[PDB]
Amino acid sequence: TIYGWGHNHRGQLGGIEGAKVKVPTPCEALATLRPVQLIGGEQTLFAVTADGKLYATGYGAGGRLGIGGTESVSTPTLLESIQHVFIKKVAVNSGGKHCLALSSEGEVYSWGEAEDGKLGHGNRSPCDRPRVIESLRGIEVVDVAAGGAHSACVTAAGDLYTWGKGRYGRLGHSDSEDQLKPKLVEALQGHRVVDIACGSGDAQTLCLTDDDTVWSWGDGDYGKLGRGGSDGCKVPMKIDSLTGLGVVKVECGSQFSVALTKSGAVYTWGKGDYHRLGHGSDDHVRRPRQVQGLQGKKVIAIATGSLHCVCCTEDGEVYTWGDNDEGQLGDGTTNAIQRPRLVAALQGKKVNRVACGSAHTLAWST
């Protein structure tokens, strides 16, 4: 079984009834795929199968689904043009309209909107089906991440590349220039990148290196870089207050940042409007702050949408908080939740995987 909820007005959840699905509901069509990954963008959902196949559902505008054309679909639809490739991971931002896909051969495919050079093909021409990024061929790529207007990947050697919109420093090349093809982030050389996340709007980028250090750069508004105040920067800089804490994952939602530790702690910081941070007030938070509503709960996975979070613990409790205008919190309402709250309908369901898109949410058990 795979449970899905939240906004479903354009087929986001792959075939179930209701423009808003306000309680976790079985999504049979997604379950039949036995996905190894589910990840959503702006009104979209992508599924990766065990045999490396890619399916998409939801809003088709701009060629964001990668199935061909711009029609929307309401059932998981095979990306046929790439079925000869074994895909192991898709990257899409919760608020994004383009994807990266990583093959077993360490190559990157991209599709969707092409504004700002985010597809990485050396121009701003849209690709409605997945296309290999040629300038990365011969380099073993091992991870991919996507922002609202930018893109990133990590190589076997631990090097980071970013590309797309340069404004406000999100690429990290010490300037504001757009990059139409992947460009090595030189300031991080000598540190091995092990996790990467990219934001939306006037965006930040976050990463984790293997020396127990978290980095942030790009747009500073609302404190989402985590160094106090609101100054942006154009080159990776450490968030010193996270050093030594055993961070294992970073994520970005809309104007906010998240870290999960080996110990199971969740930290959030950035824009506080609409309760996205989960601290129990809408104040902006300008340095990483532990989410005290998850104190002593051993969180093993977290996912962000634009304005909401979902996470699960070792024992299968699922928590959401943030905005609920589309029912994405899964409590039967469209009322915001200020602090993490257990998802009642999932109690007993043994969930160990969670995912989001812009305003929709999935949870399941392997």
CB 278 within 8 A of CB 293: yes
CB–CB of 67/130 below 8 Å? no
Q: Where are the domains of the chain?
A: 1-366
Q: What are phi and psi of 220, to 5 degrees?
A: -90, -10
What's the 3-state SS for 320-352?
Answer: EEECCCCCCCCCCCCCCEEEEEECHHHCCCCCC
Q: In this structure, which topology does domain 1-366 adopt according to CATH?
A: Methylamine Dehydrogenase; Chain H (2.130.10)
11-41 in b/e burial notation, b at 16+ Cβ within 10 A? bbbbbbeeebbbbbbebebbeebebbbbbbb
Residue 29 DSSP label: H
Q: Would you state the structure tokens that stand for residue 133, as one six-digit string?
A: 């990024």
Give the H/E segment covering residue 32: helix 28-32
Q: From CA 4, how far away is CA 337, in angstroms rounded?
A: 18
Chain CA centroid to CA 256, Å: 12
Contact 94, 33 (CB under 8 A): no
Contacts of 9 (CB under 8 A, 6+ apart): 19, 20, 43
- What are the tokens at 333? 């309402």
- 3-state SS, residue 217: strand
142 is written with which tokens?
């091992």
Closest CA to 200 of 281, 145, 282, 128: 145
